[model samples]
Target: PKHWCSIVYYELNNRVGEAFHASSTSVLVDGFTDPSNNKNRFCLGLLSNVNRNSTIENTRRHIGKGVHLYYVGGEVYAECLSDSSIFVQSRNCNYHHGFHPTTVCKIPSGCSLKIFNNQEFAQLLAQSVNHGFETVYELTKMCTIRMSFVKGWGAEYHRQDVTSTPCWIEIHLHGPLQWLDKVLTQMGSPHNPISSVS
Candidate 1:
């Protein structure tokens, strides 16, 4: 009769749909405005998958979580932009202890990155590893993911008291580099206006 947020994983690597459809009771985490104004407003959350394993466990996570993810989808919603690789995707998904931080998740030093895609751009970089197969096929053909980090009266930030768990990766072996270094060496001059049409 009471279950707001509870995902204390242990053996989640079952090899099913991975995981990436958060649901704090149908998504409700909001905090947007630093699209790159340089004030750290790149923290967001929102979901709505009543029953679909919450968007394939929120894109299967990926694994180990050193940090590195980039996704583009919208007609409804699906924007996984975990920029933590010297500026993946040219950077814009930045953060530095401002989103209600109690501890960790403050990766922003010499910040200078931005990318917004006008709200709809389907480009998975040569469809690498199926590029999450369209975010796991609309979270399993249906579309929904409002976990909102398992609810806490609107959670924009609060990962179990936070000590150092803002890490996620495990889309496992399905890319040009999907285990740790998802590429990007010193990135700083890449805003490719959609090339690769060969």
Candidate 2:
């Protein structure tokens, strides 16, 4: 019912390659990882096309050694362990043509950044709800972070959304899901609620 996050990886065409819920406080994501042995990559075995061990060399060229993710103190952090830099975009670090402005956090090798803050996110949800149901629900749907490997997108980049990036992953924070349930329950006793996330 509660977890730090889950991961949904995308291929070049923006189609989903693999998905799995997070179980560990940390994970290694990049090229040449035996997805079968690693809990994060374990699901890749079932997704043959998503399996890229055979092309590890090419994969390494793009993603390098990858990065390390950590869940600590009610916040999610991403550290780039690769030689090349990685591009990160979240509601907090959005680069899209929106109110957040065109901003993207580029984490170079060994550098890290806080991707999600549970308290800040919860506060955002609370503030927006006073505005509109549309605002509240929209934030819920956006409770995810998108990061690209060795590439960037939005405003001067090849693509608008990171969804079209060649190598990217979506971090869906389920920790907030639990909070949302509690918030909604306090508001009313409506059995009908959000759950159609595909």
Candidate 3:
């Protein structure tokens, strides 16, 4: 039997080979450390860049009325700034370290997100759009990928009625050719239709 799979890639940083500097670059990634700012007051604002100059007052200047506001993190804190204004806190629904003016959450130097699943990759793409980060598309001249069979059945009884035979597949890739090796170890079959990408 044959199965179909599809994947999509979105590059966060356009500069392909440049080393990422956290203090200088503002791109956010998973496991990026959150910065410690005003312990008592931290307003949540959704902007592309949240560096040192990002303050509650600064956020007010940029955030317009009727704009949706969200306080991220695993907390349920609230305060009334005035009769017409207030601050509320809640769990960081997006699971991202909130970026602040004094924020230090950044990806490692020269590291780009090579995601493993579609859900994570899709969320990252949405984040870029919410933060107003400009993105561009690049065409891949060529590519190569690998797959493996995770399970199988009905190999010994393939005579009377083999219509219900089953073969399960799995694919787990890490970095370079590790994917091929991992798959081969499980499936133990000769690589088929292998093609090199330029």
Candidate 4:
């Protein structure tokens, strides 16, 4: 999140994701989404950078409306339909912190989730669309992400399958790759991607 004069101000041309805990019985991954302001909102009335035409179609291909995605081994990516939407915004969901390449939820709790099986995970993701949750899995990287409504913190407890406190919930963490910020900075500058007509 960025602030101007102490007031929050988010713009487009940025990468973001969403985060939330699914049902307790369901399997979920550990990673979260990029920052976004379109909370509990649909991919309507927005445009996509990938397609100058019906960007919605491209977005649909990424994650169908009301469709949830469960994936593994790579980071998920999403473009904002709005010109001034924040990256990822919390939806009152519980988050369990840990770092396990592969694990299951030993003690699942209310309004929480964990993942271990790939096929089962994929199935769970496809079903999220109906519930306002969308899934995005990146093949190049080993990871998965989901965005949806969640219960209040302390209101629910989500246990991990690894049976060890390896990770903790981090509301704000810097980007792992410096190149991302570098790219964004380059976008803001006069570059070949766009013209200087304006």
Candidate 5:
């Protein structure tokens, strides 16, 4: 696959229900309250349980239309399509990126956000500890985005972190890993072992 990425739905840090290995450029994420509703609309569907008893209170309706993820020229963007709004925590969605200091970036319905920027990651690699090649390799080998529906986390929200939220997903970009492999190979693997700053 070219510049592939995976968006997996998680219940907490312990795990997720599914990992959609997206080979395509874009993916439509959504959930349904009724099993028959929009039976095949979403490329990926969000579930309420990662560890279920085959019976738990189903509150998966919060996701609604969910969000869309796109990989464009090595950068990943998430466009919100739900009415309740979405909360996201990632290198590009934090306070340093203009988000509220104590909150994950909130993307209301019909909004879009750059969840990951490949160029931004490259720049970070260039400025690694002592500008060392190995440090660059050690630093943030992965670029991930954790997003939730309706609710949010951080100091303001009692949940405090996405892991504490009932619903969310972790987007892992394998594209960046592939990029590193290519760059390092092209430049000739330098030094040795070194290191997610975010």
Candidate 6:
């Protein structure tokens, strides 16, 4: 029997559910010990709880001679687009040059209870967070996400992901805007369809 070196990490700040259940992302590094000759060696990615399985694998990395730098212990820096604030966390592993990386974030407090009424919708939200817009769209069976939500944050979503608070806020906030736009469109310069009952 043989074993390989694998790394796993989860979003902890959310601090509510099992690390993996909250959100899980991992990188697989199970090959080659000699780092000297390894040119491409790196894995990094992030995922939210929406997707049950969110492991991001490294696809491309280049290293040269004497570049034997390893990440022992350090802080990670990421930008939270929602608030424009800096979020930092300490590393848990002594990662070498060709190591893999994974991370996760749990479902926000209110989101799971609100927008996601059924298991299918909940899963869709998860898929949206873990994968991407097109992937979720492809997998959706009956429900569909509001186009405005998609437009609000397109592909960049994974990078600057949406959370429960904002998700709810935006849902309510967008309704009136959408209604206003529709009413204005129907008004047609406020000169037609002026006085209608029922």
Best by TM-score: 2
Give candidate 5 misplaced runs (Cα > 4 Å). 1-3, 33-59, 93-103, 129-138, 181-198
For every model shown, what is its TM-score relative to the native structure? 0.18, 0.74, 0.14, 0.18, 0.71, 0.13
What lDDT tens digits, residue by residue, belong to model 5 across residues 1-198? 343676677654646444566656776677653332222233334344436532122334557788888778767788898777888877644523765533478888999987777777766655553455555565443466778777777866787877767667777777666666555544345454342232
User: Per-residue CA lDDT of candidate 4, range 1-198, in tens?
Assistant: 111000111112223232232221212221223223223222222322331234323322332222222223322212322222111222111122343423222221222233223343334334442342112221112222222211111212352221111111212211212222333232232324565586
User: Whose lDDT is greatest here?
Assistant: 2
Per-residue lDDT over 1-198 for candidate 6, one digit per residue giving the tens place of the 0 to 100 score: 011111232222121111111011111221223332222321112223443222211110110110111211121111121211111111111121122211122222112111112333333345454443344333332221111111122232443332311111111112222333333333223323455675
Relative to the unseen true structure, what is the C-alpha lDDT of residue 169 in candidate 3, on a scale of 0 to 100? Answer: 12
Which 10 consecutive residues of model 4 have the lowest summed lDDT?
2-11
Which residue pairs does candidate 6 place in steric collision? Answer: 22-106, 23-104, 25-102, 50-126
Task: State the TM-score for model 3.
Answer: 0.14
Q: Give the poorly placed runs of model 1, Cα more than 4 Å off.
A: 1-92, 96-150, 153-159, 162-198
In candidate 6, which residue ranges exceed 4 Å CA deviation?
1-6, 9-87, 91-198
How far residue 72's Cα lies from its native spot in candidate 2, in Å, is 0.4
The 10 consecutive residues of candidate 2 with the worst lDDT sum are 41-50
In candidate 5, what residue range of length 10 has the lowest lDDT sum? 35-44
All-Cα superposition RMSD per candidate: 18.1, 5.7, 23.1, 19.3, 6.2, 20.9
Query: Candidate 2: misplaced stretches above 4 Å?
Result: 37-60, 93-102, 184-198
**Residues 86-157 of candidate 1: C-alpha lDDT, one tens digit per residue:** 112111111221233122123232232222221211233323334343342322111111111211212344
lDDT of 2 by residue, 143-181 (tens): 778787877787777678775566678788887876776
What is the Cα-based lDDT of residue 149 in candidate 3? 13
Candidate 2 vs candidate 3, lDDT winner:
2
TM-score of 4: 0.18
Full-model lDDT, candidate 5: 0.63
